[PDB]
Structure formats: structure tokens, C-alpha cells
Scaffold this active site. Structure first.
Site, mmCIF file in Angstrom:
data_model
loop_
_atom_site.group_PDB
_atom_site.id
_atom_site.type_symbol
_atom_site.label_atom_id
_atom_site.label_comp_id
_atom_site.label_asym_id
_atom_site.label_seq_id
_atom_site.Cartn_x
_atom_site.Cartn_y
_atom_site.Cartn_z
ATOM 1 N N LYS A 195 -67.934 -63.865 8.193
ATOM 2 C CA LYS A 195 -68.136 -62.674 7.439
ATOM 3 C C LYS A 195 -67.141 -62.609 6.288
ATOM 4 O O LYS A 195 -66.004 -62.886 6.415
ATOM 5 C CB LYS A 195 -68.001 -61.430 8.303
ATOM 6 C CG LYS A 195 -68.570 -60.179 7.650
ATOM 7 C CD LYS A 195 -70.018 -60.017 8.031
ATOM 8 C CE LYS A 195 -70.814 -59.246 7.014
ATOM 9 N NZ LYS A 195 -72.174 -58.961 7.538
ATOM 10 N N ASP B 65 -75.219 -58.263 2.148
ATOM 11 C CA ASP B 65 -74.986 -57.202 3.120
ATOM 12 C C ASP B 65 -74.775 -55.917 2.317
ATOM 13 O O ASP B 65 -75.109 -55.846 1.134
ATOM 14 C CB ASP B 65 -73.819 -57.573 4.033
ATOM 15 C CG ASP B 65 -73.595 -56.625 5.203
ATOM 16 O OD1 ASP B 65 -74.066 -55.507 5.117
ATOM 17 O OD2 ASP B 65 -72.934 -56.995 6.156
#
Lengths: 458, 458, 458, 458
Positions: C112, C152
């Protein structure tokens, strides 16, 4: 299942026996394990070189690059272009080079490259083509921090130039990856001299230590055997220091000066010897001339100094194994007490045996001191490292600066060898410490310590 | 000056003799030159692997990687961890692998790696340590586009996992660089079955072509000697297709069904065989059952080839030698006209000579067609290439897709061998083309053509 | 000395508790050690991003990239540009992503990235400048085989484009290193649909197992939570499959049909709601519109879960914490038997507790099977991996091809969860084998096995 | 949302307050912006180190590398192997190192690495294993031009050797990437004597400037406290210069020679103290010896400064906050004026306040000058940069060359600090410039100017 390697096996056996005989192992038993790790090269690369000859026909050769050890610094070793080169010979040469570089005291590793190429009877185009192919297949395994090839038998300035050019074309970086470059494009000074000055400096240091000063070189029959560049520059250096040269004959015959005890070679004479010795012309052609007939007595066929009754210093550079028994016991009688093999493997075993026997049985001037080729010459490697330093600094030094650094390098090497001989190979008062044992142990101990420090063995 | 390499020298001599004893050199004389260039490997790397055993003691081993040829694609060697590996053996294996991969048809090169490490009697910790050291010294030479090692004797799933992990840790790239990875982390399906299924498909192609579909691989006295997993997959495939397994031996006694003429194996029997041979249990453990003993005439300490009696299609999945000259003539007497040779060196050289002599003396229908191990067992390498394709495509296929591609690969292998035998081996009317000569000439011609196209020899 | 990381600590504690409670540590005690190794990220990079705003003032932000695990594949993850991102949040997200990708079945690892950048109230120039700076500082660590960032919260198509352009400018290689690229320059199809489709397939497999080949979507009161693209395409797919949509809810009240029992949404209505979401009109403006208010019952300031009426399929698509404990009680009282969150990463813990209590309450077929978010919304990551596969294959697939692969991926996810739930967290009564525990154990076991195989822990 | 970092936040707040208090901001307001940009590290890497101990037992540790600033040169900082190491501590150390290296005057930047590894109670095998793992995970980020780690708490010569070996094994390039290497394999000289010699030179320069050469170190009372290499070599240097060592301390009671005004610690006494500290014993454990009962006056617990008697300079190298306010007044009454913190981070803040008040209270003849630790600790970093220069130049200098360079470096650092204090802090006539404020402003101004020149902020 290990393949037989005669030369390498003999060298390893000699080193093991020398280490075991001394008192190193009892104080440091773990060093035994060290031996088992240094025998295996860190990396061996064989490649295929395919090139084209002058008639447009495909020729295939094998190139090698042994990188034996890099504990003390980047791999550094010459390239040998000879028809006899295989993995055994290159392994042997690299193994010796490790300890030589360790003795010199600079940061260079051990290694050796080359190929089966036969430069003899080849045009310049053929040499260019082969060099370009070889460097194409080799450039990915060398670098300024990884591998520094240099010159050797078969690799002169021409090959070095070709290889450097191809490396520049491939890697697109002008760096000091090879050693032996021309002076214009990042070379070095005192490079041709190198070992010739170095052996003389080493001999001077040994004389100063043994006799506690007094005479260093003046008024001594130095007898620079051989007619190569090594012998020429050794003779020039000893002449500058005040010594006399009495035996400057090559491998062919015996071109001895007129008076083996009074006459000395002149710088002009040495230059003439070089001029008619660089080509296929030999000392026979020299003695045919009147200038080298009456001035230089000719005794061809039986080594330079065998018939010479007046010798004081020995430089076995004429032939390989040129110091057998007769001359070995003649040297002490003739007054030749201090020896250093300027070249490699230039004297027989009998010379070392007589050296050891007389040095153990006598002392002072009586004790005949002989220096080993691992630490005697030490000039090519040192100047190669200085050229690497010049490349790294992007600045070219002067001749005198390089000379001073060579002086300090050989002093350091002599000191290391002498101290290691004194501490381990105890002489029990007097008895000039064995330079062979000291020089073989010093390099091994230094390499083993560095490898243990870096976790190469435990 | 070239070192003696027995196995490699024998392989090269055989290849040269096979090339000369055909009408290929006459049509393409220049191909002679090609031979020389293929003899020299493109690159050989030997390195030193230093690891630590369970008692904290330093162990030094030698690792090898031979990248022989890459004309047709990236190097695709295996890794062999056995206490016999040297440069000669790896050279021999790589040289054979070149032409095998050429026959398969996918773009793979020839190569072979490994080490003297002996995995036998080693803990998992020791295997992990050695793998990590080996991959640390090897990662700079392999790559997804450069070298793709696989498994072999000594290297299983365990070692593959360890090597892959260390490569990932060093290169910081999750790519397809080794073949034999686990199914979860980028493996392949039909990977075990590969060799057995491939050889079965190949011999099915052979039978279908020879008999024009009159005889199939089903309903035959399929021997399937040897009790390796390869024989397991071969037996399963022949059973599914409708064939009959009659003689599954090992390096010990032979589990021959009493009614080898009619009765044969079952899948449950094959699973029991697999369970026994995984756990080093002899198949006499399988005959221990009273029903099994009655239904299977065991021959303790014997392979069927000694007392073959009656089989129709011999499929030796066994290893070196096994089938002998007397055993070969027993096979030809028994009617083994369509032998498979599921694994390389399943029969002796005299066996091949007898097969060729009887094939040429016969008239096709009774000719004993011998499939060469180079072309017969291509399932493993094919599936390795398919696993590389899956890795490159980032998408794992299903079992049926891999099976279809395997069928295509073995059909291509058979076609190549047959066509090249027809062109050069020149079989007469009513005879079977020499599969060994065809498969040799095919590989050599394909590799030589690619190298000439890519400027490797002119 | 370890810093406090609330979210990550809570996630780790939950995972450990779930692992301990299940019957896995008893059978594989060594897996405990795995839990210690997977907790530590393989690599965290924090860098400084200095950019220039529209007024020419220097702005400094922090970018992060967490690479947790690469056992199962490259470090595919997402980039979050929100003014709340720190190391704790990204650590938590990466840790969850590991097991999500493990359940998915393709070869992707866990990771991430993102930054504290606030894209809200920024001109396109400001976004371009920040993206260029960020990619300049980040491109040293990402790669097609190393790291694959995606979109995202905060990173839309615009940011992806800017980052891709800068990466191409720096690395000079047009490769697939980011996911979410535009269709023209190497994008993918079904990507907007992705998760919204995917969860649907999941629940259908769930239905196919719960009812054993019985009532499908057609006749199911599927409860869409907001007109987000997830629920948008989920509603479209269920409408195509005959399912009735009986709710919708953005940040305000609930958009429910007038006759929610019988009447449902239609594709025209769905795209109208989508267009209103694009202009931020939301459901309130649709209620202001006459026709929708006539055809849809409005419940302002209320989620559908409070007034579900009668439902049997529910999905909190909006965000986390949509369904509360009381809302879950209302859902089960309404007859909701197949709650499955295709969004809502975590939910109010009371809802999951109620679902687990009811699943263990032995309600027979009419039992509320709750699917975890980790397995349900795997569609997005699956499509990201398929886009990576398209990039690697240098070919763009068609919509139905991607749809077929998505169906296979969702089936694989469901199968993995069911099998792992049956193996360890075995249900005494076959009612609803605990999809949450099953998915948790599946992910952990797969990752731990791969890491043990690759030598990451022993 | 930013995590709490106590030490780093305190350091940043102190630096900001010092900057604001001076008049640098009024002349250069834009420098305020610089303060933001320097606060954020250029890069932070955290990695996971997995290693095995002496009994298998996989252990997981966390390694850090902070690269704060590289405006002025390559990152250079130590590695700390302590159980307390986290991101906050390393961030604080790196931030201080930036300005320390800036004051030094060579081209090095700010950085700091290490790990939570606890070397205490670990075998050499365990240290070797951890070092190898750490360097395997770290070598991707360091380089001769990128990062130069060195030694610090927990990292001695042993760890440096292990790390260097592994770096060579990974990247086959023998370069200067770590500092602290052994003398044989590319080390340096005056490395242990770096700190003590440097602080002595610094204090000598300050004394010469303050008194205009009225008094030199000849016939000067020096309080060499804090038993260690720093103190030992400082005492040796001042003894060579003619200084009289009057006091000494350690982790135990003070040594204090018999006459704290006339007697001086002999080199033999210093060697005995060194032997005591090496064997972890103390002065209190050697009072029973003849050398201590007749030539030493052991002082239980009480600090050396409480019984200085006659002294004028001091170096509190024993412990943090060693000199108190009352003790400061006692020192001033005894005649102490020219203290300098040899290796201490910071004494009692009250002492510093008293010194600063006395700087303006009276003339430098009565003003007690205190040098900051960052200015006086430049010896270690200077010698590290000289070792880097030796590595780059491929030559090893002599001890006297390194000593001369150290003298020049300390002169440059002192001059920089003095001029910056004089121009910004602008003390009136007869006021000694604030060395702490001057050094702080000098470092900040130099770094900010370099960053503005290189476009790091505008």
C-alpha cells in the site's frame, strides 16, 4: 572427481608444506581451515571468442578470467595470450598473485586472465579483431572496482589499446579498468622500469639491513643477468647507485664484460644491448660486431656467469633455473653472497637449498641471502596499483613521485617479509631470516586475517 | 592443452560420426565449421559456495553453471546437486540438452548447472543454508531472459523453493527465473506427469504413423519397466487410453503380472506402486498380498529384460544400461517392434545397434522402431517451457490446456524427427526411418541454421 | 520501543485471536512462528515530496510505500492520497491486502502506498505537479516485476495518468507498472464494473451452496447501499439476472422504491441515479424530481437497514459502519439470509457478531450466511491482476473474456473459503461454515505455506 | 496525524528557537521556509531482517536507514545496534549529524542507520549471521556515492568487517562504502585517536584566539574526564603539547591523581586505565595495587570537578549533565574558563545558562567559554571523511598526513563557528561569542544555502 591441475596442485602442496613446517599452525590452529577456503577461486569464467582472420574464416578460441581472491582489494592480474593457456596454468598464476599483491601492501586482489590465442605470426588486423571479440565477451565481468586486467606474455601495449577501445565502445565510460595504457590516454610513468628498479631497491634494502649500512651498492659486482628491459633498468639503477655490472648476458650465451672484477657496463652499452636485443637479433650478432667482441668476452652456450669467477650480487633473469649447484657453491667462494631473483622461477631449487644451508650454518657476510620472486620483483604490481591510483585521482604524477612511492612500497614489502620471518621462523640469534619462508607466510597470514575479518571463514 | 573430458568427448565423437554418416555434409559442407563453434560452450561459470553446517563449521563447495548455446532461446538448464558433478559431466549434459530443446520446438537454449553438494544425510537447515549461499553467488548470472535453471537429480521442490526465495530477496523482483516452483507461488500443472505423458503421446504418434492407425497404443503389452513416477504416469495414461501394463520393475525384483499375455495393472495398483517407491519400499511389498502374489509372478532381484518372455511394446522408463544386447535380442525375438525408451540411456549401445540392424533387415511391419531418448522424453522440458510461458503471461492455465500443448509439442517432435530422417537418413521403401539419426540431424541442423542466421559462424 | 499503531495493532490482534480460536495451531504449531514474521513489513519507504502550488510557493509532503509480503507475487497495491495517511494506516491496509490477494488466487502480494496530499480543492496543475514529484521520488522502488501501485481514495484516473507519464519519462520504458491506466494507452475493460460484478458472482456461488441448486437472484430483495459504482454495477447485474433492487442510500436518507415488496429499480433508473451522483445531486434531488418520488418512497435521514421491511440479500456498498448491531437485528428480522458486503471494509463489529451468533444458532437452510468483505470485494483486485496480465501479454482482451476470468476468480475465492472453513473451523452442523473464519484461515495458511517453502521462516 | 517523536521534536524545537532568537531571520526571512524542508528526511527505509541464532530459532528484527540531507554531499552516518533503536531516535541523530557534518567542512550529509539488534550476550556466529542478513537487505540503498555507513554504539570493527564482506559478496565491487574498515583491507590511521585529538586541537585553537596566544597548552592544567579512547588520546595529545592532566573519571568513582594542581597522569597511567576499561574493571577495582595506593587518590562517587583545586580547562566526557550550576560556580572560582564538551551530548542546562550569562557579565579573561559538543566532536566524522578520501584516491596516507588534515579541519570548523557567531549573534566588545549559537547558525545557514542553490526550496 576434481580435475587434475599439475601446476596448481604443486603450488598448493608447496604452500601447505611450508605453512605446516613453520610454527604458524600451532599458535593459530584455525588457520588450517583458512587454507581450505583460499584454494577455491572465488569465480572462474570461461567464454568463447569467435573472430575472423585475414582470409575471412571463422576462428574460435577460449578466453579465461580467474578471480581467485578479493579480500584485500579488487581483482588485479595480467592477461596471458599464449597457446599453452588453460585453467590449470591461470589458476596457478592467480594463486601466486594473491600472495604477491598481499606482500606489496597495496589493495589489490589476485587473479589472472587470458586465452589460447597465438599472437605470433598474426597481422595487426587479426590482433585488433581478436581483442574486440574478447573484450565484447569479457566487459561484463570487469570494472574499475571489480577487475583490473593488465599486460603479460602476449599482451603488449597494442593489445591493451585495442581492449581499452572496445571497452570504451561497450560500457560508454572512460575509466581505469585496464592497466598498461599509453601515456597520452591515461597511462603511467616508470611503467617500463617497474620491476627493474624494484628488485634493485629490494636488494639495497636487504644489504643495508644485513650489513647494518656500510656499503649499499658501490663497488660491487652486481652482475645483472638477462638482456630484457628488466635487466636493462636494473643495471641502470645499480650504475646510478655506484655498482658495477659484469654479466649482462641473455638466455642464449655469455656476453660477459671484459673484466669481471674491474670493467663495468656503460649506459651507452646497455642502450646498445637493448637496441639490438629488442628484435630477433641476439648477443651472437653483438659479438660479431667489434664493439662487443674485444669489450665483451663471448662464452656462448653455458649460461652467462658459469665461467665468471668474480661475482658479488646475483639477479637470475637470464634463463629460468639458471642457478644450479656449481654456480651456487661458486657464488659464496666468488664473493656473491646476496641474491634476489629479478624474474620469476629464474633459479633452480639447488640455489635455495644452498642459501638455506649456508644461512643456517653461517652469519653476516658468510650467510648467503636469497630473495624469493614473490617479493623480490614486486615492481609491475606496484606500478600497476600506482597507475590505478592515478586513474582514480584523475591526475598524472611525475616520474620522481612514482619513484618515491615505489621506494616506500618495496621498503614496506621488505619490512613485512623480514618481520614475519623473524617472529615465526625464529633464527635463534644471527642466521639471516629466511626470506622465502617469511614472504610465503606473511602473505598467507595477511590474506587469512582479512578473510576471517570479512566472514569468508570462521 | 585441452583437459580430458571423457563424457563430453564421447558425446562429441558420437555426434560427429552421426553427422558424417549421412548425406548432410555433402549438401552443406560449410556445416562442418558449425560443428566446431557448437563444441565450445558460450559461457562457463564456476564459483565457490561457502556455507555453514548444523555444527557451525565452514564448508566449501564448488558451484557450476554452463550456458552452452542460446541461439534458439534463453538458456534452460537444470541444477544437479550430486557428489559427482564436475565440468565434464555438466558440459555433456548441456550439449545433449541443446539438441533436445531444439527438437521440442519451443524457444529454449542449452545449459546445465549444479554443485558437488551431497543432499543425502543433510538436515533441512543445511539444505536451506547451502541454497541461500548458492543463489547468492549465482543470482548475477541468471535472469528471466538469460538463464532459467530447473530441477534434476538432487534438486527437488525443497531446493527450488529455497533458491527462489533467496533470488527474490536479492534481486527484489518476483519473476520466472526457476522452473519447478510450487503451485501456490507461480507453479504449473501436469508438471510431474510431464515425462510419462509426453513419452506416451510420442509412442502413440509413432504407432499411429507406422501402422496407419491399424494399431494404437491401446490394447498392447506395454512393458513400462522401472518404478519411478515417470512409469507411474506412463502406466496411468496407457491404462486410460486402453492399453495394458505388463512389467513394472525397478533396480530390484520385477512386478510382472502372471498373465502378462492378457491380464494387466489397475490405477489402484499404480497408486500402490507410487506409495511404495516414494518410501523406498520394494514392490515385493506389493506382492506380499496373497492375491497379489497369485495374480503377479514376482521375479526377485531381476528386471523383465532378462526373462522377458512376451511383451509387444517395451517402454524402458529405467536408467543407464538396463536393457542389454542379449536382452535386446530377446526383445526383438518377443516382437518388441515399437520400443519407447521412456528415459534416456534405457538401453545399451549394443541394444541400439541390434535394434537398427533388425529394423533395417526387416520390412517395416516387423521392423523394430527405437525411439531415441533425446526425442522420446521431451515432456519435462516442454512443460518447463510452458511454465515459463505461464509465468510470462502472468496467468496460470488449467490442466487440459497444458495437456493439449504437450500433445502439440510431442507431435512436433515426432514430425521433425521423421522429416529430417526422410531427407537425410533416406529410408528406403517399406522401411522405418532411423529415429535416432533423424532426431540427431534435426537438432544439429536447426541449431546450425539459427547460428548461421545470427552470425555465430560464417 | 515499538511505536503505537492503533489500526494495525487492532488488525493483528484480531487475526491472532481468529487463528488461535480455530483448530489450526494444534495441527501446525510451527505456524505460530509464521505469525511473528508476517507481521513485520518486508520494506517500508518514506520519502519527501517537494512541489510547487499555483502561487509559486514550496509545499512539502510525505509519501509512503509499504511492501508487506511478496511470497505469492509482486507487491501489487494501491495509492491513497488523503490528508490522514500515515505509516499506521498504510500498514493496516497492506496487512489486510496480503490475505485478500491470497484469497483471490492470482500471484499478487500485499502492499500500500500514498501520501498526506489532499487532492480536494486543488487545480489540475497542482495535481500534475505533485504527481510528477511523487513519481520522481518513487520510481526507484517500483517496477513491472517489483511493485504495481493502483488507484484508491484520492487517486483517480487523472493521477494515474500523471504518474504513468512521469514514470515513462524517467525510466524510458513503456511498461505496466501502474494499474488503472486509460483504455487507449494500455488499460483494461470491466474495470469500472469490477468489484460490483465480482461480489455478485460470489454470492451466487454462496446461493448455489446454501440452497443446493435452488432460488437464484430472481426473487431476491437485494439491498443496494448507495449509487456508488460498486452497488451501481451490482444492481445492474442482479437486474439482468432477475434480482430485485429494493434500496439505495448515499450520505443522507434512503432511496427505496414505492412498492419495495414487488417493484424494484431498473437500468434507466440506475443510470439516472448515477448521473445525479456525478453532479452530487444524490437521492435527495431525485426525491425533489417528481417522477422518482412518485415511483420511490423516501425516508430522509435514515439508512435502509433501519427500514429494510422484508429483505433477503443485503450489501453495505457505501462505506464501513453502514450496518449497525440494531440494523443487523432488523435485517435478520426482515429475513435477510445472504448479507454479503461487496464494500464496507470492517463494519460495526456488532453486526458481524450477530451474524456469527445466528450462523452458529443452527437455523437450517433459512440461516443468514454473511460473507466477509475480504472475499466479497476481491473483484477489483482480480481485475487489476487481469490488467497486469494483459499488459504482460501485450494484448488487450475483450469484455466477455475479462468477465469469464472474473467469474473463475470469484468461484476460486468461494471454494477456497469453503474448503478452509470445512478443514479447520469445521462446523458440527453443516449450517453456514463461518465464511469469515474460513477466509481468514485460508489467507494465513496460504501465505505461511508459501513463506515456509521460500525459506522466509523455519 | 504525524506520529509523536519525543527526541526529534525536542531537537527541532530547540533549533527553531535558536534560529528565531538570533537576527538571521530578520535579514533572511525566506530561510523560514527552509526550516520546514530540512525537517522532513529525504528518505527513510525500514526493512525486516530475518536471521537464525545458534539453535535454529528464526529471529526477526527491524533495520532502519535514514537519509536526511544530501545537499552538501553523500549521506554519511553511523549504524547503531541497540535494543532501544526506533525511527524517532535515528531521526534525531541524523538531524544532528546534518549540521555536524556541515560544520566539519567536508562534503558529507546527514544520516543514520541501525537496528534493534542486541549484540550483548551474542556469539560471534550470531553477529556474523545478523550482519549478513542486514547487509543483504541494505545493499540495495547504500553505495560509494549514495550512503556511507560507519560504526557507532553496537557496531565495532567486527560488525564492520562482516557487513563489508557481505557487501562484496552481493555487489562484486571492492569499494569504500563503509567506514571503520580494518587497516589491512582499506582502513585508515588516527581512527581511534579521531575524537580526542580533534577536541584537543579545537580547544587549543579557541584558547589561542581568546588569549591572543598569551597562554598555550604548555604548562596548562587539563581535566581529562570520562575514561575511554577519547579521554586517553586527548590526555596523550595534551601531554605531548605540555598540558598537565589533573583529573579523570569513568562510570565509577573519579581517579584524581595525588596532586590535582601539580601531578600529571603519565602515559603509563593512561595505559593502565585503558587496560582497566577494556577488561570492564574500574579504578575502584585497582586501588589495592601499588600503582594506585602511591600515585592515585580514588574518590568514591564524588565528581572530579568538586575537587579540581587549580584548573582552567575541562572536558566532561564521563556522563550526561556532569557539571552542575553550583559546580560551574566552583569551577569559575577555581579559575576554569575554557571548558569544551569532548564527546558529551549536553551538560546541565543550568551550567550552560551560567556560562552564557558570564560571557556577557565580564570580559573573556573572566568569561567562561564553553564549546558545543557538535563543534568539538568533528574528529570522528572528519577522519571518516578522510578514510573515504583515501578509499577514493586508492592510496593509504601516513599518520602525520591525517593529523595535518585533522588540524586543518578543526581550524576550519572553529573559524566558521566563530565568524557566524560574530556576525549574527554580534556580541559587544569584551564579550566572548556564543560558540553553541554560532555553530548552530553556521550549520543551518550552510545547509539552507546549499539547498536553495540546488533548488530544494525557493
Amino acid at each position: 572427481n576434481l580435475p587434475v591441475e599439475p601446476e596448481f596442485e604443486q603450488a598448493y602442496k608447496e604452500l601447505a608444506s611450508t605453512l605446516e613446517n613453520s610454527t604458524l599452525f600451532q599458535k593459530n590452529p584455525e588457520y588450517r581451515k583458512a587454507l581450505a577456503v583460499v584454494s577455491v577461486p572465488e569465480r572462474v569464467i570461461q567464454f568463447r571468442v569467435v573472430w575472423e582472420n585475414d582470409k575471412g574464416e571463422v576462428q574460435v578460441n577460449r578466453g579465461f578470467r580467474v578471480q581467485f581472491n578479493s579480500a584485500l582489494g579488487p581483482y588485479k592480474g595480467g592477461l596471458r595470450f599464449h597457446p599453452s593457456v588453460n585453467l590449470s596454468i591461470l589458476k596457478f598464476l592467480g594463486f601466486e598473485q594473491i600472495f604477491k599483491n598481499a606482500l606489496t601492501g597495496l589493495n589489490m586482489g589476485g587473479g589472472k586472465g587470458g586465452s589460447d590465442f597465438d599472437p605470433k605470426g598474426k597481422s595487426d588486423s587479426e590482433i585488433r579483431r581478436f581483442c574486440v571479440a574478447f573484450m565484447t565477451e569479457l566487459c561484463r565481468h570487469i570494472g574499475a572496482d571489480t577487475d583490473v586486467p593488465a599486460g603479460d606474455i602476449g599482451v603488449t601495449g597494442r593489445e591493451i589499446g585495442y581492449l581499452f577501445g572496445q571497452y570504451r565502445k561497450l560500457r560508454n565510460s572512460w575509466e581505469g579498468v585496464l592497466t598498461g595504457k599509453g601515456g597520452s590516454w591515461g597511462g603511467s610513468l616508470i611503467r617500463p622500469e617497474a620491476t627493474g628498479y624494484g628488485v634493485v631497491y629490494y636488494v639495497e634494502h636487504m644489504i643495508a639491513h644485513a650489513t647494518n649500512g656500510a656499503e649499499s651498492f658501490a663497488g660491487k659486482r652486481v652482475a645483472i643477468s638477462g638482456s630484457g628491459n628488466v635487466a636493462q633498468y636494473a643495471a641502470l639503477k645499480v650504475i646510478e647507485l655506484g655498482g658495477r655490472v659484469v654479466s649482462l648476458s641473455d638466455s642464449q650465451g655469455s656476453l660477459i664484460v671484459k673484466d669481471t672484477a674491474k670493467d663495468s657496463f656503460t649506459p651507452a652499452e646497455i642502450d646498445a644491448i637493448a637496441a639490438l636485443k629488442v628484435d630477433r637479433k641476439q648477443i651472437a650478432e653483438l659479438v660479431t660486431d667489434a664493439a662487443f667482441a674485444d669489450k665483451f668476452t663471448y662464452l656462448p652456450g653455458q649460461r652467462p656467469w658459469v665461467h665468471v669467477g668474480a661475482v658479488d650480487v646475483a639477479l637470475p633473469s637470464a634463463t629460468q633455473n639458471e642457478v644450479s649447484g656449481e654456480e651456487a657453491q661458486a657464488l659464496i667462494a666468488a664473493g656473491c653472497k646476496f641474491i634476489a631473483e629479478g624474474s620469476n622461477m629464474g633459479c633452480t631449487q639447488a640455489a635455495i637449498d644452498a642459501f638455506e644451508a649456508h644461512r643456517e650454518a653461517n652469519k653476516g657476510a658468510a650467510a648467503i641471502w636469497y630473495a624469493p620472486g614473490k617479493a623480490a620483483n614486486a615492481g609491475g604490481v606496484a606500478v600497476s596499483g600506482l597507475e590505478m591510483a592515478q586513474n582514480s585521482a584523475r591526475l598524472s604524477w611525475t616520474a620522481e613521485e612514482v619513484d618515491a612511492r615505489l621506494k616506500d612500497i618495496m621498503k614496506s614489502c621488505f619490512q613485512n617479509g623480514l618481520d614475519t620471518a623473524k617472529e615465526y621462523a625464529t633464527p635463534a640469534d644471527g642466521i639471516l631470516p629466511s626470506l622465502v619462508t617469511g614472504s610465503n607466510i606473511a602473505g598467507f597470514t595477511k590474506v587469512a586475517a582479512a578473510m576471517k575479518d570479512q566472514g569468508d571463514w570462521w
